[PDB]
Design a protein around this ligand. Structure first.
Ligand SMILES: [K+]
Ligand SMILES: [K+]
Ligand SMILES: [K+]
Ligand SMILES: [K+]
Ligand SMILES: [K+]
Ligand SMILES: [K+]
Ligand SMILES: [K+]
Ligand SMILES: [K+]
Ligand SMILES: [K+]
Ligand SMILES: [Mg+2]
Ligand SMILES: [Mg+2]
Ligand SMILES: [Mg+2]
Ligand SMILES: [Mg+2]
Ligand SMILES: [Mg+2]
Ligand SMILES: [Mg+2]
Lengths: 165, 111, 154, 135
RNA sequence: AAAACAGUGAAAUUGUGUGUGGACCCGAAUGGAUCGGGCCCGUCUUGAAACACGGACCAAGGAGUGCACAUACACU
């Protein structure tokens, strides 16, 4: 054999490396995250992250593992239809009686954002439809219309876990 | 101005705390972990309810990265302080600064 | 040929250099330091005042145990000096560049001293006799010089 | 050059980010210019580094040696072999899964062209491919 | 005593320009004040940071070798 290989190449039997590669890949694989149970169709929730944080919205469905689908009220608070990680929602005990016909999908609300969407607002037939459903449940009720307009504010004088929602 | 808005958004939704030390003995420091106090939490039993929650350090004057994320790992002592871990080690210049506690849990891998 | 210590265009500049000159190194760099970035006509006017004891050269690096003087206040220090032999040489050198400027077809005005540097040349050896039958060194320390002046863009 | 060994493609970044950047400078090489940076073990009777006081630097030793599988691996996921002839590449024909070639510095332009042409048809990666032959 | 090529042209050391710091090393970082640990090496000595000695700075040179005579081990 030629002298370059009889010396340098000798360091390692490299045919073994695939077995190492598998074991390493396994170890640095992510842990699983649990899908929650506590949310029911038509629950009001408060948004905790991203461009829409602080507003009340209504939960519609599970979508794609941890992803969930929500609607604001384009007339009442200007928020349309969007998707978000189901952990970025705070639950509250109010439940509206809405039921929907079919599945729908929308843009995700990422945690890191650069700029606000002050303009360029339009609506689809389904956005119109779903608003014109939600609105019926809201109109008949005393202060509910105004409730959706004021942002949420955490109490700065007591421990959070003492409060109920 | 986006900074003024990003602050008000965070202020309305998070609990507040301050960074005060690294984990240390009398002689040595362990800068991978930091110690935090939370506003109205004052016993170890009260503090246990925050273990697992996300934390964020926001710094608008920074040229590199506007915020650092982390997680609360454990309670520390008997008067309601906690220990946390971040995606990068906290500088001694950043001690005394304000930290935000985010009201949802995350996994140790996400940071 | 000579490789000048920095890169400036041949058009819009004038140059000179000399080697092994027999003016004293440490005195010469204190002179050069103060006339850097100055306009050429201002430089020639200032150096005329130094020869007449009306203004001084301030000292900053080669300056230990030097005398204090009211003329140094013009540059925010107390310490100054009058090194006549170095001043006469630099003045002649600068005056020749105005001849070159005029002959080359630039103006005699708007020329600014953009680069100037002094380097040590090799020592010339000498001796003095001491007590108890000893002999000690008594050497001389000459210098090399470069200047480049350029026309202001204004 | 932006190439990777296909068997390690989904792992190479973990490997690279895991390599140490520690240096073992000789003691007091920072104090006098006559002592170079190259490691020598201290052997003085009083010496603070040999005696392992806290605050002195660390010394080399077997504990720092890398795992046998990762060792010698370039950041593209291959091991290297030196070549200087066309007849050298002929050796790699069985090993091209894990090894790549690096042409020796002293091989000149006219000859390098002949090496690269052969490398293309045999299917061997050459890491100095651009080399002097950019002009 | 010194002194080879009218080759190549390192380090100590100097000037100018541009950057970073106030003796410096190790660990960990920031947009930014810095935090924690470390006394000067070599050597004789019960014991050295020492009010023990040698060391201003850089290059090059610089110290268990050869033969004879018995010997134990390994190899033919
Ligand atoms: K000096
Ligand atoms: K290294
Ligand atoms: K000792
Ligand atoms: K090891
Ligand atoms: K020569
Ligand atoms: K030469
Ligand atoms: K001694
Ligand atoms: K003493
Ligand atoms: K002695
Ligand atoms: Mg005096
Ligand atoms: Mg005398
Ligand atoms: Mg006599
Ligand atoms: Mg004694
Ligand atoms: Mg001495
Ligand atoms: Mg030597």
């Amino acid at each position: 054999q030629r002298l370059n290989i009889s010396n340098i190449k000798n360091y390692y039997t490299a045919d073994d490396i695939p077995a190492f590669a598998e074991k390493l890949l396994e170890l640095h694989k992510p842990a699983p995250i649990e899908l929650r149970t506590d949310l029911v169709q038509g629950n009001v929730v408060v948004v905790l992250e991203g461009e829409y944080a602080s507003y009340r919205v209504v939960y519609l469905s599970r979508t794609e593992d941890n992803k969930a689908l929500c609607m604001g009220l384009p007339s009442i608070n200007g928020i349309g239809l969007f998707e978000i990680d189901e952990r970025f929602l705070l639950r509250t005990s109010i439940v509206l009686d809405i039921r929907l016909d079919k599945k729908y999908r929308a843009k995700e609300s990422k945690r890191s954002f650069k700029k606000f969407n002050t303009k360029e607002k339009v609506l689809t037939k389904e956005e119109n439809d779903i608003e014109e459903l939600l609105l019926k449940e809201i109109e008949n009720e005393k202060f509910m219309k105004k409730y959706f307009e004021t942002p949420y504010e955490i109490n700065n004088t007591v421990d959070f876990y003492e409060i109920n929602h | 101005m986006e900074v003024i808005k990003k602050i008000e958004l965070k202020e309305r939704v998070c609990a507040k705390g301050t960074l005060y030390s690294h984990k240390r003995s009398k002689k040595n420091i362990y800068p991978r972990y930091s110690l935090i106090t939370i506003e109205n939490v004052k016993t170890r039993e009260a503090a246990m309810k925050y273990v697992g929650n996300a934390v964020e350090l926001f710094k608008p004057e920074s040229t590199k990265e506007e915020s650092i994320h982390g997680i609360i790992k454990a309670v520390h002592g008997r008067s309601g302080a906690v220990r946390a871990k971040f995606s990068r080690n906290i500088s001694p210049v950043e001690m005394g600064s304000k930290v935000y506690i985010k009201l949802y849990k995350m996994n140790e891998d996400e940071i | 040929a000579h490789k000048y210590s920095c890169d400036i265009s041949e058009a819009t500049s004038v140059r000179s250099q000399y080697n092994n000159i027999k003016i004293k190194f440490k005195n010469t760099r204190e002179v050069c330091n103060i006339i850097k970035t100055m306009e050429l006509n201002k430089a020639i006017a200032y150096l005329n005042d130094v020869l007449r004891f009306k203004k001084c050269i301030p000292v900053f690096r080669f300056a230990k145990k030097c005398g204090r003087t009211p003329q140094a206040k013009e540059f925010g220090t107390d310490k100054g000096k009058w090194p006549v032999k170095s001043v006469a040489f630099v003045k002649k050198m600068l005056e020749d560049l105005l001849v070159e400027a005029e002959k080359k077809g630039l103006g005699t005005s708007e020329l600014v001293i953009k680069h100037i540097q002094v380097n040590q040349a090799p020592k010339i050896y000498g001796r003095k006799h001491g007590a108890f039958g000893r002999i000690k060194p008594y050497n001389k320390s000459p210098s090399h010089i470069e200047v480049i002046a350029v026309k202001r863009e204004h | 050059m932006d190439i990777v060994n296909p068997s390690l493609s989904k792992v190479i970044d973990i490997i690279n980010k895991g390599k140490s950047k520690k240096q073992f400078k000789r003691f007091q090489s920072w104090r006098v210019k006559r002592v170079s940076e190259s490691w020598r073990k201290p052997r003085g009777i009083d010496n603070r580094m040999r005696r392992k006081f806290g605050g002195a630097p660390d010394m080399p030793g077997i504990g720092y040696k890398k795992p046998n599988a990762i060792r010698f691996l370039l950041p593209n996921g291959y091991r290297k072999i030196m070549v200087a002839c066309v007849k050298d590449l002929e050796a790699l024909i069985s090993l091209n899964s894990f090894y790549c070639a690096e042409i020796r510095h002293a091989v000149g332009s006219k000859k390098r062209i002949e090496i690269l042409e052969r490398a293309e048809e045999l299917g061997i990666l050459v890491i100095n491919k651009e080399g002097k032959l950019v002009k």
